[PDB]
Design a protein around this ligand. Structure first.
Ligand SMILES: [Mg+2]
Ligand SMILES: [Mg+2]
Ligand SMILES: [Mg+2]
Ligand SMILES: [Mg+2]
Ligand SMILES: [Mg+2]
Ligand SMILES: [Mg+2]
Ligand SMILES: [Mg+2]
Ligand SMILES: [Mg+2]
Ligand SMILES: [Mg+2]
Ligand SMILES: [Mg+2]
Ligand SMILES: [Mg+2]
Ligand SMILES: [Mg+2]
Ligand SMILES: [Mg+2]
Ligand SMILES: [Mg+2]
Ligand SMILES: [Mg+2]
Ligand SMILES: [Mg+2]
Ligand SMILES: [Mg+2]
Ligand SMILES: [Mg+2]
Ligand SMILES: [Mg+2]
Ligand SMILES: [Mg+2]
Ligand SMILES: [Mg+2]
Ligand SMILES: [Mg+2]
Ligand SMILES: [Mg+2]
Ligand SMILES: [Mg+2]
Ligand SMILES: [Mg+2]
Ligand SMILES: [Mg+2]
Ligand SMILES: [Mg+2]
Ligand SMILES: [Mg+2]
Ligand SMILES: [Mg+2]
Ligand SMILES: [Mg+2]
Ligand SMILES: [Mg+2]
Ligand SMILES: [Mg+2]
Ligand SMILES: [Mg+2]
Ligand SMILES: [Mg+2]
Ligand SMILES: [Mg+2]
Ligand SMILES: [Mg+2]
Ligand SMILES: [Mg+2]
Ligand SMILES: [Mg+2]
Ligand SMILES: [Mg+2]
Ligand SMILES: [Mg+2]
Ligand SMILES: [Mg+2]
Ligand SMILES: [Mg+2]
Ligand SMILES: [Mg+2]
Ligand SMILES: [Mg+2]
Ligand SMILES: [Mg+2]
Ligand SMILES: [Mg+2]
Ligand SMILES: [Mg+2]
Ligand SMILES: [Mg+2]
Ligand SMILES: [Mg+2]
Ligand SMILES: [Mg+2]
Ligand SMILES: [Mg+2]
Ligand SMILES: [Mg+2]
Ligand SMILES: [Mg+2]
Ligand SMILES: [Mg+2]
Ligand SMILES: [Mg+2]
Ligand SMILES: [Mg+2]
Ligand SMILES: [Mg+2]
Ligand SMILES: [Mg+2]
Ligand SMILES: [Mg+2]
Ligand SMILES: [Mg+2]
Ligand SMILES: [Mg+2]
Ligand SMILES: [Mg+2]
Ligand SMILES: [Mg+2]
Ligand SMILES: [Mg+2]
Ligand SMILES: [Mg+2]
Ligand SMILES: [Mg+2]
Ligand SMILES: [Mg+2]
Ligand SMILES: [Mg+2]
Ligand SMILES: [Mg+2]
Ligand SMILES: [Mg+2]
Ligand SMILES: [Mg+2]
Ligand SMILES: [Mg+2]
Ligand SMILES: [Mg+2]
Ligand SMILES: [Mg+2]
Ligand SMILES: [Mg+2]
Ligand SMILES: [Mg+2]
Ligand SMILES: [Mg+2]
Ligand SMILES: [Mg+2]
Ligand SMILES: [Mg+2]
Ligand SMILES: [Mg+2]
Ligand SMILES: [Mg+2]
Ligand SMILES: [Mg+2]
Ligand SMILES: [Mg+2]
Ligand SMILES: [Mg+2]
Ligand SMILES: [Mg+2]
Ligand SMILES: [Mg+2]
Ligand SMILES: [Mg+2]
Ligand SMILES: [Mg+2]
Ligand SMILES: [Mg+2]
Ligand SMILES: [Mg+2]
Ligand SMILES: [Mg+2]
Ligand SMILES: [Mg+2]
Ligand SMILES: [Mg+2]
Ligand SMILES: [Mg+2]
Length: 336
RNA sequence: CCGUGAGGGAAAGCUGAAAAGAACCCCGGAAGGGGGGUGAAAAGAGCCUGAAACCGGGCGGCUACAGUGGGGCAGGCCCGAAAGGAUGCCCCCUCCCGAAGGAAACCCCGGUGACGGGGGAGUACGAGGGAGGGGGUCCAGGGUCUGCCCUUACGUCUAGAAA
RNA sequence: GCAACCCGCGAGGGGCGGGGUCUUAAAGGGCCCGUAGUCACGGCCGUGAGACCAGAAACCGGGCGAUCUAGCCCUGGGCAGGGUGAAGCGGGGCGAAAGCCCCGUGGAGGCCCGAAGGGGUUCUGAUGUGCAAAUCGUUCCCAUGACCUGGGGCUAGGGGCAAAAGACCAAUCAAGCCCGGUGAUAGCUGGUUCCCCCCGAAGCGGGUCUCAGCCCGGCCUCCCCGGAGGCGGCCGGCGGGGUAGAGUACUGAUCGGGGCCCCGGUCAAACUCCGAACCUGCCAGCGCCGUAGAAGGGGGGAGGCGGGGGCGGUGGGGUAAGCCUCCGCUCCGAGACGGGAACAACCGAGACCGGGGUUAAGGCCCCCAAGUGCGGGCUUAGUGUCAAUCUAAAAGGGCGUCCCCCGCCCAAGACAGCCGAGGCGGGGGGCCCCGAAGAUGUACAGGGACUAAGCCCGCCGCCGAGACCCCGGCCCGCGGGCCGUUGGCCCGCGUGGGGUAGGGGGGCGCGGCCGUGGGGCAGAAGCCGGGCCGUGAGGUCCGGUGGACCCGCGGCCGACGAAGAUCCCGGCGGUAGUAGCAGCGAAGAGGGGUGAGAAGCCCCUCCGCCGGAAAGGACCAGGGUUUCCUGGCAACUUCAAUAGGCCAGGAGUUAG
RNA sequence: CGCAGGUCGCAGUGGCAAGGGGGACCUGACUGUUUAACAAAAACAUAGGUCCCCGCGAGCCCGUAAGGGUGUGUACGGGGGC
RNA sequence: CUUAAGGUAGCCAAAUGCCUUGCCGGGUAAGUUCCGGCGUGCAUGAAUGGAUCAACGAGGUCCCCACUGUCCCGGCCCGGGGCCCGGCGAACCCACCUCCAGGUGCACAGUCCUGGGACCCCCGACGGGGCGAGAAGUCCCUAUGGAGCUUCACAGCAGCCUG
RNA sequence: GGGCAUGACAGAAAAGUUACCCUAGGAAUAACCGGCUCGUCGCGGGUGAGAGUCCCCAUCGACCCCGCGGUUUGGUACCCAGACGUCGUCUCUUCCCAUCCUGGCGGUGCAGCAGCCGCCAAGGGUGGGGCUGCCCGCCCAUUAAAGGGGAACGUGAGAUGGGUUCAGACCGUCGCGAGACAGGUCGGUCUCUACCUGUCGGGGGCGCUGGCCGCCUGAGGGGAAGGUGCCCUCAGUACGAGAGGAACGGGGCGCCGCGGCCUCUAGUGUACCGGUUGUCCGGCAGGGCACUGCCGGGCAGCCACGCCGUGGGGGAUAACCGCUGAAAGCAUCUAAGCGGGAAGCCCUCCCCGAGACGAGGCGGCCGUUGCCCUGGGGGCAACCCCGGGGCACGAGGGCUCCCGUAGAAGACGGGGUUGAUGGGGGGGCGGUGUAACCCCCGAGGGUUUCCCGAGGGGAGAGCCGGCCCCUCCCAAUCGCCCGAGCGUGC
């Protein structure tokens, strides 16, 4: 094998490293959360920028407990989501596949939805609810199709993003269906989904970096004593043994960046209602300003400075829950 | 033409009988193109004939879920004027003869049995060879494609070649 | 003589005898003798000649070269700047003096640093189908001298020249180049051109400066003579042998007992009293072959003289080997085809063509034709999945399980601790389990998978080759017959039909010649496609194109047949509208004009580069009209063009 | 060529131009020459040392020969080795 | 004894020491190299020159300081290739042309066997494979093949000496 | 007729050397790899003399024997001489297990701490230096440990070139000599524009049973996405004569790897601002060039030396440990049955994903039509059938246009006048560092003190922004296209 042992360069868990099929994240897994009341299990916001905040450590066992610590934070422009449709899911008896049985739409959708959907001039919402109601006894899941409102964001674009978010919180599918039916045509704010201080998961398409060499894409080492090597140094020496041939595990140049990624257990520091208290006087660089509600998350988030990020309840939460009290943000760097 | 030099040293034939060598008109910057002429024939000065490789277009067949070339059989589409048959070919029916080979039901004897034996029966049938009846139009042959069966480029040394 | 066959003569053939001659004292022996040659045409082979075609490195002869380079000679040119400070020479200080020190002046040197110039170290940089068949960048060495450099001169090939590396002597040097000897030779390597038919090998023995060759025999082929016997099989009569085994008696080893002998025991390729199977000699018979020709002999031509696989000799050697070296049958080579999962030689089996049928090996759950066939038993491990190549397995352990046998106890007082029926111990057999560990990808050995579709003992039917049987067609060998015949046709018989090298027989095609008969402007040759004939080489015809020659038949003659030689010449592809048109320290822009057409030509303005120079002035050799003017863009300039060192026309160089 | 004063910067030989230095061993004294096109060296040469053949009609060498070089020279010399 | 003599002055694990990373010191945290010693030194030694380093060195080697992207370890930027467009427009190589696994076979298969996969086409990049291309392998052997050099090979010829 | 001789004995008369080398060939024949073989080498097992205070087997294992691997060396000579680039290293991927650590278990001559031995187990790790060209080996400081092997002795159309192994040269030894030594030593050209395939990314199209839009599902594929340490408590406790000295459980944090991000810090930043040298533009100002002239700062962006995330669990199991339990009146973890049991396998988790041809589900939009020209056929009376072409209807899609959450080309994303998409203008924020003008001071000199003069001070900053906001002032226009519709059979 190798002359000296060492781990492989890069990961084979993100193979193939191709561009994402969609710029919107497509969440595969949604957790099962018991909150006592029906509620959406996720939210979508726009990544606006990064700051740092002084936060008092609220972990009693932590070695910085009671002290003020500077933490890098991410700001998400989070205007309310407009609930357009409600869809029901059953299980196919032939294979157990989750299959949609039907969906009821609001009768008059907004004009912005016509930019992305071929909709009828008016929906027969009552008839669609009657059609859905006969599938209630076999329903295993219910989700709401929601749309973003980019006019209320700092981007100011008009085309919305449409995605399904499941309704959870209680173990009764009928209560979930009733809550989803009640949500039709209304708007959900981030405070209605999450609470400050809780952990979430973030899913998003990371920043695109275009075609990149093997040194940056996989972290392969430049050839030592770089000037000694004819035909360059930003390369692997060999590209494989004689047998097998070129494998799929061999590092090669290609697309880097624009891939869907999931990051676990990011703590919601704040959920503000007016973005003026968080926007810098110069504004967020390359984004603009925040006027509506915003989410202040701890740490970093995948994606560029305008990407749509999906926050969900955690699927791999730690054993010890965070403190029930809201975290104390003493000062954000955007403030004076 | 090559080498300082002694020396070395190619490629390259063909209008038409007669220039009758293409008048004249339109276009083009021009090479030139269209029309129109000469000539038995463009044989057009890049000049007898004018092959293949090669490239362009038309036509026929295939063409994005199926691994390629060659052969045999069956078929789909296309050609099938002449030089081949059309007294053909194919279908059906009937009749006759028929090599080697050769059943079945059913009845009888035996075996646990798979099966054997007597009769049925050298029977029905059987390569092929003759005769006739009706029905139809092409048949042979060719191009391409598909299905099934078969199939390890050539020349060479070698004990041994797809190597 | 029914014939069978017997008898007589008996050319040719065979033998003896006789004769000529040599040797010898002679005998004996050697050669020769009772008839056929010669000339020619065609063919095959041998030797020489270039000798089927192509191929050396070399060697010799006569000539050419010192524009390169090596050395030296004659006559010119060149080397910024700085530093150090030799001999020599002055002053100052110090001594009683002999005498020391300090400073200056001076300008030596195969001296130092460093431009030009010369050289060529590092990056083992770039390049490496390059800018270039030796370059470029960078870093370096010398740079007043054994220094660098121009012109002229000398030294020439077995010779020169060499501060020496066998360097250099015109991109050529452990002996130049040119032409010639010369088609040098080559046991070696490559190539060697049409068809059908008959037969059909070898890699063995001996000799060889022989081991990649060759000759003599064995093996093949063709022709002839000869004349009736022959032998890969078998029985029998009469013989030979000394292996396997056996023995331990001769020659040797070797373990015990008993008293140098006796007894038991272990061995022998180089031991043998005995001794097979088996092989082999003669005779008789059988079997088969043979007068359509046995034995035997003569002549022509070879190939080949590298073998290989399976099985057997415990062959001999070796740890073993798909190892080395012998012996025998068979098969591959030179043999199709079925099975083996592929596979030259393992099994079956030997193929002219087409069809029908039946079988061989092997198989019959699917892939895949034929059986989820039949009876009994075993296996629980997916063990295993019907010989070998071919992918496996040992000592050892296991009542895991199925079974066979033997010894003992139990006489119901036997094994376990009164109970009541079997218990204990030993040996062996079958299958399976552990022993059992590898490298790209699944219980691998075909895959699916199977609890039988595995294994053992038996059984029944079926499928399945080109083999065997039948039919039709074709061809061959041999014999017979007919025809005026360098040949053609017919018939009969064949347990006739594979075939490389090679031998033998016939035919097709190409160019011409001797004859003979014809076609062609109402369309020859050639070219494109197509039909028909012929096993085939090939022939012939149709339609189109084309525009003057061509063909059938008999005979003869050749510069006579290509798919290949890293073949020769030419044309043309894919690669590919791809590489390159970067690198070496400059570059363009605006407006106008001309013009078919302008980023690029002409003019102005702006911007830039050199400026002891890849760049301004002069000029040698060499080049030779490239100079100037006018016009132009078919070709040339790594793109364009109206531009040009290009093309066309004209002109131009004045000396005491 | 020098002296005094003032003054700015991160940086005053400000760009350009422009030595890293020291110790020890082996080896060849040094400068010089060399395999044009893979070897620049410790290889060659070198001054210095030493030996040999030679008094000239010599020694050594070239030429077939005629003759030639060393030699327009002479042992403080010519030639030949290490 | 001895081929005559038997290595003197010196110098050494040396560019000369096999054993051998010799043994002892120094240097480093760690030293097969290096330096200073030791020497019955395979196989050191005197113009075959010994010892010997002042000066000189594009010589070979070890250490120290300074220095630093050599490296921990990689990042950003600049010019030219690059990529795209317009114009010009080749070459190498080429029997045909090839998805993967495990086998088999002139023993290392694109073409054979048994499997696993693949919708087809186009662009960029690389260099694992095509025992990739270039060059009738210089390494080894054979040939009754060469060339040059050597001498105590077999012969010969000049030259010199002698009668 | 006898002898004189060829012994290489079926009869030439015959020494070396070439690494300066040349030719013709040869896998008939070596060197490397490959093939066959395994003596050798590495590994496993049977046996038990003997040692182990006693005690064969905790730990060894004499004398012998049976095996396995292909990891060293050798044998052979089957392939390859018109050529498979020869050691080591770098770089990068994968596979094996005969396991060095990490997980599980057992034995012990296991009191604890430690150590030794065996079994399962290959998911992860196995590092940094000194010495030698090395491989190997020894050593240093750490560490959980610092395992070993295969892949054409993996990988030179990827590198390097220290070694070996050309031509030069020196030493020692050998040779009369030229020369030779797998003895030492110094020097000594690493060619190729990638045709096919593979791999990694990026595009066009057809198909999915009429076309399309949006949202989903999940067959299957990839994954290491995680691995591993330390400290405190336990506890100076258990254990122990003492010395010494644990563990389960709880709390805290690293290191290695992986995936993101740019708030901070660091780097860069030939956008930008300033200082300054030499020269040219007549001087000031401003500027050219010194290949950003050099120096200092530095927004955005990118980036790491910075920051963030990076888990437990379930199931069947291995080695085995147990329950019940007969065969076999007892006993027995096993035969039937049942319980427990690993960093390993599957799922959970992350990424790709309907070309998943059984080409999927849901909701919606659309088409499911007409007209014109021309050809042929049927019956001619209308008419009808079929071939070709054009036009309209039509959901949806693209090109052109302004851009950037994107980007080699393609693609993707946003906007496109019911518009804030790029520019302009205004404002915000920010970089540099305080322009011009004006006034004050200025070492000293002179036209004495209204002049020169490097320079300091005050007010003023000045310049600039590949960032944010507002504002229709300019330009997102004009235009060019694709597009289902019909029959058939089962
Ligand atoms: Mg290099
Ligand atoms: Mg012509
Ligand atoms: Mg016809
Ligand atoms: Mg006819
Ligand atoms: Mg051969
Ligand atoms: Mg061979
Ligand atoms: Mg042969
Ligand atoms: Mg062949
Ligand atoms: Mg001859
Ligand atoms: Mg000769
Ligand atoms: Mg001569
Ligand atoms: Mg000259
Ligand atoms: Mg000098
Ligand atoms: Mg070099
Ligand atoms: Mg280089
Ligand atoms: Mg190159
Ligand atoms: Mg100098
Ligand atoms: Mg030499
Ligand atoms: Mg010569
Ligand atoms: Mg010649
Ligand atoms: Mg025969
Ligand atoms: Mg041969
Ligand atoms: Mg007998
Ligand atoms: Mg015997
Ligand atoms: Mg015996
Ligand atoms: Mg015998
Ligand atoms: Mg032989
Ligand atoms: Mg044999
Ligand atoms: Mg077979
Ligand atoms: Mg069947
Ligand atoms: Mg055995
Ligand atoms: Mg098995
Ligand atoms: Mg035959
Ligand atoms: Mg004739
Ligand atoms: Mg041929
Ligand atoms: Mg040619
Ligand atoms: Mg071409
Ligand atoms: Mg181009
Ligand atoms: Mg290019
Ligand atoms: Mg300049
Ligand atoms: Mg200038
Ligand atoms: Mg000049
Ligand atoms: Mg001119
Ligand atoms: Mg002119
Ligand atoms: Mg001219
Ligand atoms: Mg400089
Ligand atoms: Mg020197
Ligand atoms: Mg020098
Ligand atoms: Mg050289
Ligand atoms: Mg050199
Ligand atoms: Mg010397
Ligand atoms: Mg001296
Ligand atoms: Mg001497
Ligand atoms: Mg001594
Ligand atoms: Mg040394
Ligand atoms: Mg010594
Ligand atoms: Mg000596
Ligand atoms: Mg000496
Ligand atoms: Mg000596
Ligand atoms: Mg000396
Ligand atoms: Mg010395
Ligand atoms: Mg094999
Ligand atoms: Mg191939
Ligand atoms: Mg050769
Ligand atoms: Mg050669
Ligand atoms: Mg040699
Ligand atoms: Mg010979
Ligand atoms: Mg010669
Ligand atoms: Mg002999
Ligand atoms: Mg061989
Ligand atoms: Mg070998
Ligand atoms: Mg190899
Ligand atoms: Mg062993
Ligand atoms: Mg034991
Ligand atoms: Mg081996
Ligand atoms: Mg081979
Ligand atoms: Mg080869
Ligand atoms: Mg290769
Ligand atoms: Mg090669
Ligand atoms: Mg194991
Ligand atoms: Mg290798
Ligand atoms: Mg290479
Ligand atoms: Mg390679
Ligand atoms: Mg080297
Ligand atoms: Mg050498
Ligand atoms: Mg000597
Ligand atoms: Mg060397
Ligand atoms: Mg390349
Ligand atoms: Mg390419
Ligand atoms: Mg990272
Ligand atoms: Mg800067
Ligand atoms: Mg100024
Ligand atoms: Mg200027
Ligand atoms: Mg500049």
């Amino acid at each position: 094998g190798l002359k000296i042992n060492r781990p492989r360069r890069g990961s084979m868990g993100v193979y193939p490293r191709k561009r994402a099929a969609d710029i919107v994240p497509r969440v595969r897994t949604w957790p099962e959360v018991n909150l006592g009341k029906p509620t959406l299990l996720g939210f979508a916001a726009y990544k606006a920028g990064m700051l740092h905040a002084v936060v008092v450590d609220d972990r009693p066992t932590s070695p910085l407990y009671g002290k003020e610590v500077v933490k890098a934070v991410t700001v998400l422009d989070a205007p309310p989501l407009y609930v357009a449709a409600v869809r029901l899911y059953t299980l196919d008896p032939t294979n157990g596949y989750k299959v949609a049985v039907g969906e009821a739409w609001v009768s008059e959708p907004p004009a912005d939805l016509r930019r992305v959907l071929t909709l009828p001039e008016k929906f027969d919402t009552e008839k669609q609810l009657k059609a859905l109601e006969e599938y209630r006894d076999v329903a295993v899941d219910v989700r709401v199709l929601v749309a973003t409102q980019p006019r209320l964001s700092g981007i100011g674009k008009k085309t919305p993003e449409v995605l399904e978010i499941p309704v959870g919180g209680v173990p009764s599918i009928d209560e979930r269906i009733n809550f989803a039916i009640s949500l039709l045509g209304k708007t959900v704010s981030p405070k209605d989904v999450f609470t400050p201080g809780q952990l979430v998961d973030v899913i998003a398409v990371t920043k695109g970096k275009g075609y990149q060499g093997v040194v940056k894409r996989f972290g392969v080492t430049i050839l030592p004593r770089w000037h000694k090597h004819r035909k360059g140094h930003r390369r692997t020496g060999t590209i494989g043994p004689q047998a097998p041939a070129l494998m799929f595990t061999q590092p090669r140049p290609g697309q880097m960046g624009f891939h869907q990624r999931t990051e676990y257990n990011k703590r919601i520091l704040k959920i503000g209602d007016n973005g003026a208290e968080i926007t810098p006087k110069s504004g967020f660089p390359h984004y603009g300003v925040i006027k509506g509600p915003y989410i202040l998350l701890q740490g970093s988030v995948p994606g560029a400075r305008k990407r749509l990020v999906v926050l969900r309840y955690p699927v791999r939460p730690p054993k010890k829950a965070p403190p029930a009290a809201e975290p104390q943000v003493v000062w954000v760097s955007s403030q004076s």
